[PDB]
Amino acid sequence: SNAMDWVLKHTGPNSPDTANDGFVRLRGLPFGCSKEEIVQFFSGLEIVPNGITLPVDFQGRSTGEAFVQFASQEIAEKALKKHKERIGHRYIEIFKSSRAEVRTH
């Protein structure tokens, strides 16, 4: 078990029983809960640098709900429990993503 951080088998499109990978979704997110941040924020997760994208502006007005790709569910879940894990100061109420929403490439 836990090959990377908490990794499973990586047997689906990237681990089994997932939309694709490891569904995590930043929601109600404050200031710049984004690629590199999310990756190392909950250090210990196989969070892909930039399988994440906050609905932002050029300024970086992250708000509604953002995309987060985790190579396996466990990793994904360590962050699907990430409710109220701000950056800046707003309840990061993460959702169990649909990888569908998630990424943009």
From Swiss-Prot:
Instruction: Fill in the subunit field for this protein.
Output: Component of a ribonucleoprotein complex containing mRNAs and RNA-binding proteins including DDX5, HNRNPH2 and SRSF1 as well as splicing regulator ARVCF. Interacts with TXNL4/DIM1.
Which disease is the protein involved in? Intellectual developmental disorder, X-linked, syndromic, Bain type: A form of intellectual disability, a disorder characterized by significantly below average general intellectual functioning associated with impairments in adaptive behavior and manifested during the developmental period. MRXSB patients manifest developmental delay, intellectual disability, autism, hypotonia, seizures, and dysmorphic facial features. Only females are affected.
Query: Is Phosphoprotein among the key words of this record?
Result: yes
Source domain of life: Eukaryota
Question: Which location does the Swiss-Prot or TrEMBL entry give for the cross-link Glycyl lysine isopeptide (Lys-Gly) (interchain with G-Cter in SUMO2)?
Answer: 9
Q: Where in the cell is it found?
A: Nucleus, Nucleoplasm
Tell me where the signal peptide lies.
none
Keywords, A to Z, come to: Acetylation, Disease variant, Intellectual disability, Isopeptide bond, Methylation, Nucleus, Phosphoprotein, Repeat, Ribonucleoprotein, RNA-binding, Ubl conjugation
What is the covered span of the full protein?
Answer: 94 to 194 of 449
GO process annotations (BP): regulation of RNA splicing
Provide the function of this protein: This protein is a component of the heterogeneous nuclear ribonucleoprotein (hnRNP) complexes which provide the substrate for the processing events that pre-mRNAs undergo before becoming functional, translatable mRNAs in the cytoplasm. Binds poly(RG).
**Know the name of this protein?**
Heterogeneous nuclear ribonucleoprotein H2
Q: Which GO terms describe its molecular function?
A: RNA binding
What tissues harbor this protein?
A: Expressed ubiquitously.
Q: What's a GO cellular component annotated to this UniProt protein?
A: cytosol
* Species of the source: Homo sapiens
Domain (RRM) ranges: 22-99
Does the keyword section mention Ligase? no
